Amino acid sequence: AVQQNRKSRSRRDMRRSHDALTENALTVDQATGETHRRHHVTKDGFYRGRQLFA
Amino acid sequence: ARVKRGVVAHRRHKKILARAKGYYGARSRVYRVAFQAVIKAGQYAYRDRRQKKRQFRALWIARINAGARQNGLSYSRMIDGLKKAQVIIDRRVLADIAMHDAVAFAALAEKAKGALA
Amino acid sequence: MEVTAKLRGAAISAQKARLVADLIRGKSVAHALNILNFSNKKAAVLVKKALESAIANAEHNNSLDVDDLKVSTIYVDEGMSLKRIMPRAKGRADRITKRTCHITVKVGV
Amino acid sequence: MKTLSAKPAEVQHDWFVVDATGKTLGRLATEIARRLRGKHKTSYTPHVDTGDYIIVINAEQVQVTGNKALDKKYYRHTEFPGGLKETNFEKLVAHKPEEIFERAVKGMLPKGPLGYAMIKKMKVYAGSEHPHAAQQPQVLDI
Amino acid sequence: MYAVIQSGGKQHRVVEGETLKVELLKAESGATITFDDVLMVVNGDNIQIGAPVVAGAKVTAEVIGHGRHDKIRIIKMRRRKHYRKQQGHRQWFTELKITGISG
RNA sequence: GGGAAGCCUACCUCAAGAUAAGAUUUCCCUAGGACUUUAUGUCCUCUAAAGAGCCGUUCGAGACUAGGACGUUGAUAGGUU
RNA sequence: GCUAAAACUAUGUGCCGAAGCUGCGGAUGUAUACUUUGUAUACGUGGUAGGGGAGCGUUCUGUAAGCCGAUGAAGGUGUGU
RNA sequence: GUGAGGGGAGUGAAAUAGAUCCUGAAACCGCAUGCAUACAAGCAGUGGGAGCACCUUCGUGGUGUGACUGCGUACCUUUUG
């Protein structure tokens, strides 16, 4: 099964009208004060005022 | 004497594409599709130059009918009365007066009805 | 006045890079950098490279402060493609297109 | 370009009220359609709505002649297989009088967006009262 | 005040100071033209309807110039019959300016 | 007037995108400037309410969704007894 | 949608209605006269297969050791006529 | 990233002549501005036609858009069609 007519650019863009991306949830940490992904350990090993690597 | 076709062919295709401005999709981009669209537009225009006169005469007749029925006659009786009273004003002017000046149209209706009587 | 950076010949499809471009179009540079830093898309790395290059150009060649910059203009164009051959079943061959793209970023205040 | 079209911003719609007691359905619907479309005004334009608002009261007293009370049929089709439904004039007039007038005038109006707009100016009420006293309708004997 | 005149097989309703285009005339530019066959004169409430024509009425106009309307393409095509032809057209006209109306 | 497993109701489910978009109870928001295109007009400063969502622990709900419960004023899941 | 019709039969007075006919403006073929003409009148001007007539553009040779050109050629892209 | 690629500086008559580099058309793919578009059925135009935006010799002007409306079943070939 294949198309009988080539699809127009208009209909192609209409189909793609649902492809937009979305933003993550970011938050400024307390103890250190940089941005991190919410509910995740910061890239330097801190989470809720505890250190993972001394 | 070898002849290259590029410049003349390009000019012809470009003129057709320029006459195709404003059409939807490939009808303003693709030469094969755009060429068919211009010929059909020409045919439609040729036929509609005749259709326009009919449409406008129908509009004038409708407005004259409304005015005559406001003044107590029908269109056919008003036309007959004016013809018997020898008035030769045409339907375009009669419709213009009907739409823009009610008193003059009432006077014309009185003339026609007097001729009918 | 706008300050421009171009990344040409990036090894990714324009259709894929345009999603990240649309994500960051119109925002302030700090917010856009946060988004690009915490995105998981491949095109995020390339767009971040281009944006940081644009910020560096604005700072060093025009003497502008970064606190007021925003992403005023961004778009992605198609690049030159590479052509390859993939063998199918029963001796048939198909043609493969490997696509690239150009990224343009302009910042201004 | 001396022949002018009416402008929608300058059209003026007047309100009228019509009693349907003892009238014949079709011979009333023709006049209602005329006045809804605006054929009675000298500014009539085919692509502009210039008509009036018509309120119809005492809708269930409308009449038909002959044996049409038992015999005239109203059909509709749900688009499921075998879904053709049928009723007649006596049941329909006792149940929903507004539908009879809506069908009769819908049949006589143009079939497009302008026709949909023109049918919205007809208000049909079963009893002798209407809620549009604020528009001060005039009595129309048609 | 307005009047009804006939020129070039058609009729026009005119007021003083109006410029209008009619079919091509033979009058030279700058000349004056008199219509002595007025069909109607209206002066607010004074209404004169000529039986064929109002007796004594006159409308005076002045010729501005001559010209041609915009180009029109004529296309004829019979499908599947190997036939096609085309031609252009521009219609001549004369411009007039009404200067006087007397009932 | 009577008159059938037939028609309309009656029984179950869905149903106001019924654009004619219906009804009821309760809750929220009442600040100052400048300008002309004197208008539900346009730009400043100050204000972010009732709520909804992102996120997390998840489900007798689930393709993805949607829907249900909870988020320290806590038994939502795991563990422990 | 229509029932002393918006049906049928008979008669009448009006009107609508085509690229038909008339009005106004313009073009063209043939013929007859002006006894060069490009001016009149008359009759014409839907067309497949076909037949006849008249033209537009393109490359190259002569005219050209001429004429236009860095005060901007060809080519590309708009606008006006 | 001692990468690719770019932004300055410099050379040049010219760097949108910057190395697969004279000119750089079309299909095809982006970004920005103006207008229209989420109650309405079909070769997508054509004859009308309101409103809006910009320009303006301020109009019976120009440019872009086209709510609503009459008519309207592509092209070629082969065929009695």
Swiss-Prot record, chain A:
Disulfide bonds: none annotated. Pfam families: Ribosomal_L32p (PF01783). InterPro entries: Ribosomal_bL32, Ribosomal_bL32_bact, Ribosomal_zn-bd. Residues 24-33 have a biased composition (Polar residues). Residues 1-43 are annotated as: Disordered. SUPFAM superfamilies: Zn-binding ribosomal proteins. GO terms for cellular component: large ribosomal subunit. The keyword DNA repair does not apply. GO terms for molecular function: structural constituent of ribosome. Keywords: Ribonucleoprotein, Ribosomal protein. Residues 6-15 have a biased composition (Basic residues). The keyword Ribosomal protein applies. One of its GO terms (biological process) is translation. NCBIfam families: rpmF_bact (TIGR01031). Belongs to the bacterial ribosomal protein bL32 family. This is Large ribosomal subunit protein bL32.
UniProtKB/Swiss-Prot annotation, chain D:
Keywords: Ribonucleoprotein, Ribosomal protein. GO terms for cellular component: cytosolic large ribosomal subunit. GO terms for biological process: negative regulation of translation; translation. The keyword Ribosomal protein applies. GO terms for molecular function: mRNA binding; structural constituent of ribosome. It holds the Pfam family Ribosomal_L13. It comes from the Bacteria. This protein is one of the early assembly proteins of the 50S ribosomal subunit, although it is not seen to bind rRNA by itself. It is important during the early stages of 50S assembly. Part of the 50S ribosomal subunit. Belongs to the universal ribosomal protein uL13 family. This is Large ribosomal subunit protein uL13. It comes from Acinetobacter baumannii (strain AB0057).
From Swiss-Prot, chain E:
GO terms for cellular component: cytoplasm; ribonucleoprotein complex; ribosome. Transmembrane segments: none annotated. SUPFAM superfamilies: L21p-like (SSF141091). The keyword Membrane does not apply. It comes from the Bacteria. The keyword RNA-binding applies. Keywords: Ribonucleoprotein, Ribosomal protein, RNA-binding, rRNA-binding. GO terms for biological process: translation. GO terms for molecular function: rRNA binding; structural constituent of ribosome. It holds the Pfam family Ribosomal_L21p. Part of the 50S ribosomal subunit. Contacts protein L20. Belongs to the bacterial ribosomal protein bL21 family. PANTHER family: 50S RIBOSOMAL PROTEIN L21, LARGE RIBOSOMAL SUBUNIT PROTEIN BL21M. This protein binds to 23S rRNA in the presence of protein L20. This is Large ribosomal subunit protein bL21.
